[PDB]
Design an enzyme around this catalytic site. Structure first.
Site, PDB file in Angstrom:
ATOM      1  N   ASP A  59      26.095 -19.186 -24.270  1.00 13.50           N
ATOM      2  CA  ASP A  59      27.434 -19.708 -24.016  1.00 13.50           C
ATOM      3  C   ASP A  59      28.193 -19.384 -25.341  1.00 13.50           C
ATOM      4  OD1 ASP A  59      29.861 -21.151 -23.957  1.00 13.50           O
ATOM      5  OD2 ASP A  59      28.971 -22.613 -22.502  1.00 13.50           O
ATOM      6  N   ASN A  86      31.209  -8.805 -23.417  1.00 13.51           N
ATOM      7  CA  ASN A  86      31.968  -8.705 -22.151  1.00 13.51           C
ATOM      8  C   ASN A  86      32.561 -10.034 -21.718  1.00 13.51           C
ATOM      9  OD1 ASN A  86      32.374  -7.554 -19.139  1.00 13.51           O
ATOM     10  ND2 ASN A  86      31.030  -9.418 -19.023  1.00 13.51           N
ATOM     11  N   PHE A  91      43.547 -17.023 -16.619  1.00 10.15           N
ATOM     12  CA  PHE A  91      44.129 -17.818 -15.543  1.00 10.15           C
ATOM     13  C   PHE A  91      44.613 -16.849 -14.437  1.00 10.15           C
ATOM     14  CE2 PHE A  91      44.133 -22.192 -17.065  1.00 10.15           C
ATOM     15  CZ  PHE A  91      43.708 -22.015 -18.389  1.00 10.15           C
ATOM     16  N   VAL A  93      46.927 -15.014 -11.520  1.00 11.64           N
ATOM     17  CA  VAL A  93      48.345 -14.661 -11.434  1.00 11.64           C
ATOM     18  C   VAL A  93      49.150 -15.874 -10.941  1.00 11.64           C
ATOM     19  CG1 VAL A  93      50.035 -13.171 -10.167  1.00 11.64           C
ATOM     20  CG2 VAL A  93      47.830 -12.268 -11.031  1.00 11.64           C
ATOM     21  N   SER A 136      41.407  -5.325 -22.986  1.00 10.89           N
ATOM     22  CA  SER A 136      42.172  -5.115 -21.748  1.00 10.89           C
ATOM     23  C   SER A 136      43.440  -4.376 -22.046  1.00 10.89           C
ATOM     24  CB  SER A 136      42.625  -6.477 -21.145  1.00 10.89           C
ATOM     25  OG  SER A 136      43.493  -6.270 -20.018  1.00 10.89           O
ATOM     26  N   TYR A 190      46.667 -14.685 -22.246  1.00  5.79           N
ATOM     27  CA  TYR A 190      45.428 -13.842 -22.206  1.00  5.79           C
ATOM     28  C   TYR A 190      45.677 -12.550 -22.981  1.00  5.79           C
ATOM     29  CZ  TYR A 190      42.267 -10.544 -19.708  1.00  5.79           C
ATOM     30  OH  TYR A 190      41.327  -9.583 -19.317  1.00  5.79           O
ATOM     31  N   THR A 193      45.096 -12.952 -26.581  1.00  6.44           N
ATOM     32  CA  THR A 193      43.670 -13.070 -26.975  1.00  6.44           C
ATOM     33  C   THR A 193      43.079 -11.658 -27.028  1.00  6.44           C
ATOM     34  OG1 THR A 193      42.578 -13.270 -24.725  1.00  6.44           O
ATOM     35  CG2 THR A 193      43.586 -15.298 -25.758  1.00  6.44           C
ATOM     36  N   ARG A 228      37.590  -5.343  -9.211  1.00  5.65           N
ATOM     37  CA  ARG A 228      37.479  -6.404  -8.201  1.00  5.65           C
ATOM     38  C   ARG A 228      36.350  -7.359  -8.638  1.00  5.65           C
ATOM     39  NH1 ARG A 228      38.106  -1.494  -5.585  1.00  5.65           N
ATOM     40  NH2 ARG A 228      35.863  -1.138  -5.030  1.00  5.65           N
TER      41      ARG A 228
HETATM   42  N1  LIG Z   1      40.459  -6.445 -13.800  1.00  5.18           N
HETATM   43  C1  LIG Z   1      39.505  -7.048 -14.410  1.00  5.18           C
HETATM   44  O1  LIG Z   1      38.538  -7.669 -13.798  1.00  5.18           O
HETATM   45  C2  LIG Z   1      39.519  -6.926 -15.905  1.00  5.18           C
HETATM   46  C3  LIG Z   1      40.475  -6.016 -16.505  1.00  5.18           C
HETATM   47  C4  LIG Z   1      40.493  -5.855 -17.905  1.00  5.18           C
HETATM   48  C5  LIG Z   1      39.570  -6.599 -18.727  1.00  5.18           C
HETATM   49  N2  LIG Z   1      38.667  -7.442 -18.091  1.00  5.18           N
HETATM   50  C6  LIG Z   1      37.697  -8.087 -18.992  1.00  5.18           C
HETATM   51  O2  LIG Z   1      36.382  -7.778 -18.473  1.00  5.18           O
HETATM   52  C7  LIG Z   1      35.426  -8.810 -18.957  1.00  5.18           C
HETATM   53  C8  LIG Z   1      34.650  -9.193 -17.713  1.00  5.18           C
HETATM   54  O3  LIG Z   1      35.545  -9.891 -16.812  1.00  5.18           O
HETATM   55  P1  LIG Z   1      35.253  -9.898 -15.230  1.00  5.18           P
HETATM   56  O4  LIG Z   1      36.451  -9.275 -14.548  1.00  5.18           O
HETATM   57  O5  LIG Z   1      33.896  -9.341 -14.938  1.00  5.18           O
HETATM   58  O6  LIG Z   1      35.362 -11.446 -14.972  1.00  5.18           O
HETATM   59  P2  LIG Z   1      34.385 -12.483 -14.208  1.00  5.18           P
HETATM   60  O7  LIG Z   1      33.863 -11.939 -12.908  1.00  5.18           O
HETATM   61  O8  LIG Z   1      35.152 -13.783 -14.194  1.00  5.18           O
HETATM   62  O9  LIG Z   1      33.147 -12.559 -15.227  1.00  5.18           O
HETATM   63  C9  LIG Z   1      33.333 -13.193 -16.504  1.00  5.18           C
HETATM   64  C10 LIG Z   1      31.928 -13.349 -17.070  1.00  5.18           C
HETATM   65  O10 LIG Z   1      32.088 -13.971 -18.380  1.00  5.18           O
HETATM   66  C11 LIG Z   1      31.313 -15.164 -18.442  1.00  5.18           C
HETATM   67  N3  LIG Z   1      31.880 -16.152 -19.359  1.00  5.18           N
HETATM   68  C12 LIG Z   1      33.046 -16.814 -19.288  1.00  5.18           C
HETATM   69  N4  LIG Z   1      33.099 -17.726 -20.302  1.00  5.18           N
HETATM   70  C13 LIG Z   1      31.898 -17.636 -20.984  1.00  5.18           C
HETATM   71  C14 LIG Z   1      31.294 -18.357 -22.085  1.00  5.18           C
HETATM   72  N5  LIG Z   1      31.925 -19.424 -22.670  1.00  5.18           N
HETATM   73  N6  LIG Z   1      30.055 -17.904 -22.497  1.00  5.18           N
HETATM   74  C15 LIG Z   1      29.368 -16.926 -21.874  1.00  5.18           C
HETATM   75  N7  LIG Z   1      29.839 -16.286 -20.786  1.00  5.18           N
HETATM   76  C16 LIG Z   1      31.136 -16.625 -20.345  1.00  5.18           C
HETATM   77  C17 LIG Z   1      31.317 -15.645 -16.965  1.00  5.18           C
HETATM   78  O11 LIG Z   1      30.300 -16.637 -16.785  1.00  5.18           O
HETATM   79  P3  LIG Z   1      30.397 -17.795 -15.633  1.00  5.18           P
HETATM   80  O12 LIG Z   1      29.872 -17.153 -14.338  1.00  5.18           O
HETATM   81  O13 LIG Z   1      29.470 -18.906 -16.173  1.00  5.18           O
HETATM   82  O14 LIG Z   1      31.867 -18.209 -15.519  1.00  5.18           O
HETATM   83  C18 LIG Z   1      31.041 -14.308 -16.263  1.00  5.18           C
HETATM   84  O15 LIG Z   1      29.667 -13.921 -16.474  1.00  5.18           O
HETATM   85  C19 LIG Z   1      36.299  -9.972 -19.526  1.00  5.18           C
HETATM   86  O16 LIG Z   1      36.346  -9.846 -20.933  1.00  5.18           O
HETATM   87  C20 LIG Z   1      37.717  -9.633 -18.989  1.00  5.18           C
HETATM   88  O17 LIG Z   1      38.800 -10.073 -19.865  1.00  5.18           O
HETATM   89  C21 LIG Z   1      38.627  -7.640 -16.709  1.00  5.18           C
HETATM   90  O1  LIG Z   2      51.333 -10.926 -13.307  1.00  4.46           O
HETATM   91  C1  LIG Z   2      51.239 -11.600 -14.379  1.00  4.46           C
HETATM   92  O2  LIG Z   2      52.024 -11.616 -15.376  1.00  4.46           O
HETATM   93  C2  LIG Z   2      50.132 -12.632 -14.490  1.00  4.46           C
HETATM   94  N1  LIG Z   2      48.704 -12.299 -14.241  1.00  4.46           N
HETATM   95  C3  LIG Z   2      47.857 -11.477 -14.917  1.00  4.46           C
HETATM   96  O3  LIG Z   2      48.215 -10.715 -15.838  1.00  4.46           O
HETATM   97  C4  LIG Z   2      46.374 -11.426 -14.364  1.00  4.46           C
HETATM   98  C5  LIG Z   2      45.478 -12.662 -14.909  1.00  4.46           C
HETATM   99  S1  LIG Z   2      43.743 -12.259 -14.853  1.00  4.46           S
HETATM  100  C6  LIG Z   2      43.622 -11.385 -16.506  1.00  4.46           C
HETATM  101  N2  LIG Z   2      44.079  -9.963 -16.409  1.00  4.46           N
HETATM  102  C7  LIG Z   2      45.471  -9.620 -16.044  1.00  4.46           C
HETATM  103  N3  LIG Z   2      45.685 -10.115 -14.659  1.00  4.46           N
HETATM  104  C8  LIG Z   2      45.092  -9.501 -13.626  1.00  4.46           C
HETATM  105  O4  LIG Z   2      45.223  -9.898 -12.434  1.00  4.46           O
HETATM  106  C9  LIG Z   2      44.245  -8.189 -13.939  1.00  4.46           C
HETATM  107  C10 LIG Z   2      42.925  -8.684 -14.571  1.00  4.46           C
HETATM  108  C11 LIG Z   2      43.059  -9.013 -16.072  1.00  4.46           C
HETATM  109  C12 LIG Z   2      43.282  -7.764 -17.002  1.00  4.46           C
HETATM  110  O5  LIG Z   2      43.962  -6.788 -16.625  1.00  4.46           O
HETATM  111  O6  LIG Z   2      42.752  -7.790 -18.137  1.00  4.46           O
HETATM  112 CL   LIG Z   3      42.009  -2.742 -18.627  1.00  4.42          CL
END
Ligand SMILES: NC(=O)c1ccc[n+]([C@@H]2O[C@H](COP(=O)([O-])OP(=O)(O)OC[C@H]3O[C@@H](n4cnc5c(N)ncnc54)[C@H](OP(=O)(O)O)[C@@H]3O)[C@@H](O)[C@H]2O)c1
Ligand SMILES: O=C(O)CNC(=O)[C@@H]1CSCN2CN1C(=O)CC[C@H]2C(=O)O
Ligand SMILES: [Cl-]
Length: 273
Positions: A59, A86, A91, A93, A136, A190, A193, A228
């Protein structure tokens, strides 16, 4: 025995990275998760595909959990070859949670949790190791919306980790005080961050070059694309397997490669920060 590890490995992009590392990485692959039940279920999913990930709880918001993992890696492997940061949260949209609460909640995990994993695990990284921090493309939208003075600070090639920590804390406190617009901040909590994750990666890559010259370690930030997962939704462009491609690329850069290092990488290509 070589070892690779993924944080937030139980679902989403992190699970897909674990799967690809199980197929490709010469050595053990540790799936970590904050919840043991969800981590174990994800290991069983991969074992049903013929793969053999190891598991360890992690964690990133619990410094004791991070230190327990550090001690396990030192004992079992003498260090760590590949680290994929990773784990992250966001939050939805249009989520109605107040902006200052989104700022504090996202910042705690995505910036300070990832930073604590790097603080504890970077010293374990072996020569020819790779570190991948998942950022991101929302960090670019956030950076471009900052005041010109904040953009200069976040693009600086000499910023220290402590200066970056001050900026991340300043964003959170400015949202609580209701002054974040006047103070030059953008309005995605976000995305700020992820500015933090991108700039932290640049600072840590510079430190490795200065202090571990010769150890051939490569450390980069990356953008996986819109994927997704539970963070996003079914409209997103990429499967988790597709989202994993750039992080896997950065984790498996061939030995002795000179770069990319300290870059912000999307679709396997360096983006200008
Ligand atoms: N479009 C996208 O999906 C997108 C785009 C750009 C960047 N990202 C980045 O990609 C990475 C993966 O996101 P995802 O889309 O795969 O999201 P996700 O399906 O919500 O997976 C997030 C993962 O992070 C874990 N996590 C959250 N808080 C944690 C903590 N305190 N300690 C350890 N693990 C924790 C979650 O665990 P739990 O199951 O316990 O919640 C889950 O395993 C994130 O950094 C996200 O910002 C995603
Ligand atoms: O449309 C907006 O301004 C508000 N929502 C988001 O940006 C939305 C929250 S989830 C975090 N990231 C940006 N968002 C997404 O739906 C794409 C996944 C994720 C990302 O691109 O990093
Ligand atoms: Cl991205």
């Amino acid at each position: 025995i070589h070892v690779a590890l993924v944080t937030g490995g139980n679902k989403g992009i992190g699970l897909a990275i674990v799967r690809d590392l199980c197929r490709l990485f010469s050595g053990d692959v540790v799936l970590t998760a904050r919840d043991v039940t969800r981590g174990q279920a994800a290991v069983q999913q991969l074992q049903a595909e013929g793969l053999s990930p190891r598991f360890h709880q992690l964690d990133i918001d619990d410094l004791q959990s991070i230190r327990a993992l550090r001690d396990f890696l030192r004992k079992e492997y003498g260090g760590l070859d590949v680290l994929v940061n990773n784990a992250g949260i966001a939050f939805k949209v249009a989520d109605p949670t107040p902006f200052h609460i989104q700022a504090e909640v996202t910042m705690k995990t995505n910036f300070f949790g990832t930073r604590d994993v790097c603080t504890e695990l970077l010293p374990l990284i072996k020569p020819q190791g790779r570190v991948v921090n998942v950022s991101s493309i929302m960090s670019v939208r956030a950076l471009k919306s900052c005041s010109p003075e904040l953009q200069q600070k976040f693009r600086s090639e000499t910023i220290t980790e402590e200066e970056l920590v001050g900026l991340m804390n300043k964003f959170v406190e400015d949202t609580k005080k209701g002054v974040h617009q006047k103070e030059g901040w953008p309005s995605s909590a976000y995305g700020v961050t992820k500015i933090g994750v991108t700039v932290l990666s640049r600072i840590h890559a510079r430190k490795l070059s200065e202090q571990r010259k010769g150890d051939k370690i490569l450390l980069n930030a990356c953008c996986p694309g819109w994927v997704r997962t539970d963070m996003a939704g079914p409209k997103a462009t990429k499967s988790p397997e597709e989202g994993a491609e750039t992080p896997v690329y950065l984790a498996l850069l061939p030995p002795d490669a000179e770069g990319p290092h300290g870059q912000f990488v999307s679709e396997k290509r360096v983006e200008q920060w």
